[PDB]
Amino acid sequence: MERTFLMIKPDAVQRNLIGEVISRIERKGLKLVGGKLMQVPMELAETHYGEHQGKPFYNDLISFITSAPVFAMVVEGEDAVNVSRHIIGSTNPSEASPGSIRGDLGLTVGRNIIHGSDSLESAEREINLWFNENEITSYASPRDAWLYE
Amino acid sequence: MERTFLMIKPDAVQRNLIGEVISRIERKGLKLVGGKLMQVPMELAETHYGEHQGKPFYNDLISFITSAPVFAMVVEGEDAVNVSRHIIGSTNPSEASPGSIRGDLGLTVGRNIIHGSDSLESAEREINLWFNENEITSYASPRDAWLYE
């Protein structure tokens, strides 16, 4: 089944919102298949956020993401990449739909709760960057027969 | 006052979200006026969803809706039909607004949690199809003085 990379950022961690973010992912029908609380080393931060090296927020992003643990996830489900982006909401929490993770819990664009892969291509890159395959489980669940034709 | 027919589908029943969906309806201010847990007969499913007869998903539609019990409901309030459609959200859960029942809880279009009548006339037909009048109660909520001018 399709997989994406999700990551609860240090603002949500330091706000004691880990369970609440997870609940939103779970209740959507997405399956957690990889999951670890970890500190992000500088090298990992930078390769993760490589595409943004040009920009004025870059230094502040790298600092932020490396300032306290994140909860990194691999998440499975039909159309999982676009589904997750949909529930996460716009990069800017003031544009994100109410009801979305960022919309409900994020205040500013730079501190916006959670990351999700932006495409299949960047899902497979990020999943490989953050996880080894031995860290990723595969398992059938009761509700699987009810989520899918 | 205006009434609509809502039905918590088998996916939400088998995922144990009955209470959660009812709560979404109740806090919107809609009044539950009829409700029963029931298995859907083949004949009722087919007449209820007859407008979809030769669409590719129809056989799946009919097998799903008959596969386990549903929670059938008559709900009352000003503009109940549209108000209900609005908190249910789009047919496809990944189009449905975050914060809507389908946006938050459904994963795929085939398994989208809850049904609501799509028009005033389809509400009266579906209400009549699913309930006899002696199944529909009549009562004043203390809250009404405050939902309306």
Added chain:
Amino acid sequence: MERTFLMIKPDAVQRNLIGEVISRIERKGLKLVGGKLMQVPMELAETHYGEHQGKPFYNDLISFITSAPVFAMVVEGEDAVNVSRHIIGSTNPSEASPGSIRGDLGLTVGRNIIHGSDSLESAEREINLWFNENEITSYASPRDAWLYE
């Protein structure tokens, strides 16, 4: 730091939705810095809602806002006026996004749960009108370093 005036209306008070409304404000990141349960004198209502004096709904507005107590608040945070309106949703709960306070909890345009100031000008006006400076507390919170760069 930018601040705005939010007011939980007698309909949410009379449906016992006070904590639930306050929770959506808090979890967005907004900091409650002033707050008080109070009956609204007629003159306070009239000056707060003076703009609408001509309109056909004005008399209903005044009677409604004075029918039971309200919860008056001053809330603080970056872009607080717009951020507040965003989570609150459109005046009409039927056009407000699912997931917003008005979309999930309101039923009609006149019984729509909460007020927020509509610009920086009206924020300062409403805060001054409803509160004295000595009822508005100023304080560092733990989360602050995680909401903002």
